[PDB]
Design a protein around this ligand. Structure first.
Ligand code: ASC
Ligand code: FE2
Length: 858
DNA sequence: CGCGCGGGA
DNA sequence: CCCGCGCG
């Protein structure tokens, strides 16, 4: 029973209830952004507003609650309606919150019962130098109660489901309400500038007679000198104003052992007057869903008003398409306050757009399911498998005779012997080409493979997986592995634990996992994970088409490619890649940053969009933007350089991994292609110089990431191993080692290194950072793709002029103003569902893996 | 090159 | 708050 709750609630009082529970037969925590973390991380009770829980129910991450009908009598009926998705109770209600009318008793002993009285009161109070009303007009959450009083709704509700095609923005009731709000602004009774902080400051300072706020504000008003009351929201045209109602709710996740135990704790250890009172003592709960305790609290007039307005209002829809509703209505109110549209114009356009975006979002969810379940172009067959197995077994004989003749196995000039683990190694730089791995210096006996990872012995199995997964490693000279998926997830967590435990660095616990990693230096390998058919981390569709594997242990499982290590023979391609890194470094095109605190120093290039730079309106880091304008030879030179670097590396990988192009084609949108680096799935490229990196999962990158290494100057490197602790392996990069791995789902790092001589190990990742490609596809939509270079040229000149006239603080004013315009442009395209990549709508990230292949052997 | 300013949130 | 940016 580990219960999550938001940090700003009463956790210590809940801990009291849980102590009183643990006795008769637990740990409450406050993780940052719980509402984003819980959606990704479920694969435990959770305390959060019901509106997210509807999305968790479409996501199946919440246990159906089965409360007794006598228990359901203990709480209010509308609270249970807030937690029932598709006719199934998704959680237990706790608290009820909604906006109320807050008023200063010394200016206003009798607050107005109707909105229509307010204009008359403002006249009088303006004569005294004060005002009738000040509330946040910037967010529709606050303005909607007035708008919807006379009719008008978000999405129509019937049969326990919201019709996303039936929006109520344009209804006559909504038109009258928005009209009354704008009339108040025109007569200077309110000013369309008024935000949360302004209105809060003006009320708590006695400068206005009323504001509109929820219970969170009560705590702040209590510190002021204001004698205030809290009452029902004014009626509009004799109608109750309808504030949205949020029910703080406790839910149980479908990935939980303790389900009937947790159900017992919630029913008769917290949802009691004793338990809710202990929490209310810690932090104020507001109104309560339990009828017994709500009658106690409502003795407080402020609490009675909160439940009053909550019952007079509408329960906030728990569907994700409410985001569309919110963006369209936010724009309608803003425009109709600033006279940028008529009330009737702004509500008509918001009705249209909100319904449009709700439609596209449901369409996008179904398109995403096809992405996740997509299959590689079928090249597997039993005949193909057999003929490929003959070719592989033959290449194994050819490779064995080549090893007898040469006296050992070799990667470039480096002696490969998997009996030894290479702890330090020497590189020679005989000439101006890349430094070459020549000698193993320090070693230990090579630790065995961990029990969850198996080397595939059969050439037939090697062929099965090669054809079905789109992997063709160097024939006769590779090792394929199979990793159980449950144990892979266990070990990923064990590795993150060790890193945390060490102080977010390489320390003893990370070193302990490393000591049991097996060396695959010099080797070319692929690790396939296998998912047993349920009868969590990864999401294979077991309804997909099934192949008959030759090995029975695959039957009833799905396979996917989590990691592959390549050894690139030095030649034309390594010359091209290394030359581009040298060109970009020499030309000052890398943006030096610190990563993971001060874990390491990385250099970045590629098609970033650093929104933090306000003048940034085109692809590239800020040096790139400048180079296109200031060059006196060719403005696109660095872009040609970046495209060739990404395409040469991509091509090298593609030859061995035929699924990579398939993945690129599957996840990059038409709108995203111009902002990828050439015809690859790479938009950002890193570069490290002799850096270790701590063990981590990359969360906001693509499905598969590429890392490559190369060397300059002679010397000796100790440490610097690349480690994949959940696959139970590590390796020293040699002449030109590349790893392609699923970084969303595979913990990885790089041990610290110590060097002798001038030797430099250059590490570089080629990855897909989806935020930059999405924002750039959005900028392209709003302004035109080919117009961004011209806009970026104008913004650089405008800022440089400002600096050279009025000082740097003028220049900063200009940059911040450009950021707001860029931001608004992006937000509009974002609201129209413009994306550069396809993303999981549930997780807000790219899928965990792709191209799952189901195997069955009847 | 250390450090303030800065954006999205 | 983080695989930026530009100023002293
Ligand atoms: O461990 C790592 O090494 C590379 C680094 O050399 C380039 O950034 C990187 O991406 C890490 O995840
Ligand atoms: Fe990484």
């Amino acid at each position: 029973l580990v219960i999550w709750i938001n940090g700003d609630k009463g956790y210590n009082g809940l801990a009291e209830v849980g102590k009183k529970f643990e006795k008769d037969t637990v740990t409450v925590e406050h993780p940052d952004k719980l509402e984003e973390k819980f959606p990704q991380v479920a694969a435990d009770i959770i305390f959060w507003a019901h509106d997210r829980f509807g999305g968790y129910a479409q996501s199946g991450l919440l246990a159906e609650i089965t409360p007794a009908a006598a228990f359901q009598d203990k709480l209010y009926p509308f609270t249970w309606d807030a937690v029932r998705y598709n006719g199934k109770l998704i959680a237990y209600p706790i608290a009820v919150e909604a906006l109320s009318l807050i008023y200063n008793k010394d200016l206003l002993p009798n607050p107005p019962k109707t909105w229509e009285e307010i204009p008359a009161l403002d006249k009088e109070l303006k004569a005294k130098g004060k005002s009738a009303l000040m509330f946040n007009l910037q967010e529709p959450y606050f303005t909607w109660p007035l708008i919807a009083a006379d009719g008008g709704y978000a999405f129509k509700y019937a049969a326990g489901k919201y019709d996303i095609k039936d929006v109520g923005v344009d209804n006559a009731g909504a038109k009258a309400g928005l009209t009354f709000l704008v009339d108040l602004i025109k007569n200077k009774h309110m000013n369309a500038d008024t935000d949360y902080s302004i209105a809060e400051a003006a009320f708590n300072k006695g400068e206005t007679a009323m504001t509109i706020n929820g219970p969170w504000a009560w705590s702040n008003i209590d510190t002021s000198a204001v004698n205030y009351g809290v009452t029902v929201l004014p009626t509009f045209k004799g109608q109750p104003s309808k504030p949205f109602v949020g029910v703080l709710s406790a839910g149980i996740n479908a990935a939980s052992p303790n389900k009937e135990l947790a159900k017992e704790f919630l029913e008769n250890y917290l949802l009691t007057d004793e338990g809710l009172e202990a929490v209310n003592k810690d932090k104020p709960l507001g109104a309560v869903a339990l009828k017994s305790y709500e009658e106690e609290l409502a003795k407080d007039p402020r609490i009675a008003a909160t439940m009053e307005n909550a019952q007079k209002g509408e329960i906030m829809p728990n569907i994700p398409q409410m985001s569309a509703f919110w963006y369209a209505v936010r724009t309608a109110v803003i425009n109709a306050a600033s006279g940028r549209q008529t009330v009737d114009a702004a509500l008509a356009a918001a009705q249209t757009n909100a319904a449009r975006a709700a439609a596209m979002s449901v369409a996008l969810a179904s398109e995403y399911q096809l992405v996740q379940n997509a299959q590689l172009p079928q090249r597997w067959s039993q005949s193909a498998r057999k003929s490929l197995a003959i070719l592989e077994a033959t290449a194994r004989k050819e490779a064995t005779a080549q090893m007898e003749a040469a006296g050992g196995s070799f990667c470039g000039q480096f002696p490969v012997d998997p009996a030894f683990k290479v702890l330090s190694l020497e590189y020679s730089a005989p000439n101006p080409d890349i430094a070459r791995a020549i000698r193993r210096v320090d070693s230990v006996p090579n630790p065995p493979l961990p029990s969850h990872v198996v080397a595939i012995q059969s050439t037939a199995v090697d062929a099965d997986l090669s054809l079905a997964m789109g992997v063709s490693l160097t024939p006769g000279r590779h090792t394929s592995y199979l990793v159980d998926a449950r144990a892979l997830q266990q070990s990923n967590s064990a590795a993150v634990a060790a890193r945390k435990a060490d102080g977010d660095k390489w320390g003893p616990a990370c070193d302990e996992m490393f000591r049991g990693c097996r060396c695959v230096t010099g080797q070319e390998v692929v690790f396939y994970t296998a998912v047993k058919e349920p009868a969590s981390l990864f999401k294979p569709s077991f309804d997909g088409p099934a192949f008959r594997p030759s090995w029975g242990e695959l039957s009833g499982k799905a396979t996917g490619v989590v990691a592959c290590v390549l050894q690139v023979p030095i030649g034309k391609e390594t010359d091209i890649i290394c030359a581009e890194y040298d060109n970009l470094v020499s030309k000052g095109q890398f943006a030096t940053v610190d990563r993971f605190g001060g874990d390491h120093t990385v250099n970045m290039t590629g098609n970033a969009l650093i929104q933090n730079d306000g003048k940034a309106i085109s692809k590239g880091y800020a040096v790139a933007h400048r180079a296109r304008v200031t060059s006196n030879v060719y403005g696109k030179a660095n872009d040609v350089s970046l495209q060739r670097l990404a395409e040469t590396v991509w091509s090298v990988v593609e030859k061995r991994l035929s699924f990579m192009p398939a993945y690129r084609d599957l996840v990059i949108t038409e709108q995203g292609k111009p902002f990828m680096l050439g015809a690859t799935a790479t938009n950002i490229i890193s570069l490290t110089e002799n850096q270790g990196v701590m063990l981590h999962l990359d969360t906001d990158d693509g499905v598969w990431t590429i890392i490559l290494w190369f060397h300059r100057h002679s010397g000796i490197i100790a440490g610097g191993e690349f480690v994949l602790p959940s696959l139970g392996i590590s390796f020293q990069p040699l002449d030109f080692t590349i790893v392609v791995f699923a970084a969303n789902t595979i913990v990885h790092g790089t041990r610290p290194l110590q060097t002798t001589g001038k030797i430099i190990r250059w590490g570089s990742s080629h990855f897909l950072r989806f935020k930059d490609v999405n924002a750039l596809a959005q900028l392209g939509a709003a302004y035109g793709v080919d117009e961004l270079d011209a806009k970026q040229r104008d913004q650089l000149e405008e800022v440089d002029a400002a600096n050279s006239k009025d000082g740097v603080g003028a220049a900063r004013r200009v940059a911040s103003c450009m950021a707001a315009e860029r931001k608004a442009a992006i937000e509009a395209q974002k609201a129209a569902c413009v994306r550069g990549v396809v993303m999981n709508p549930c997780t807000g990230r790219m899928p965990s893996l792709l191209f799952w292949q189901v195997w069955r052997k009847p």
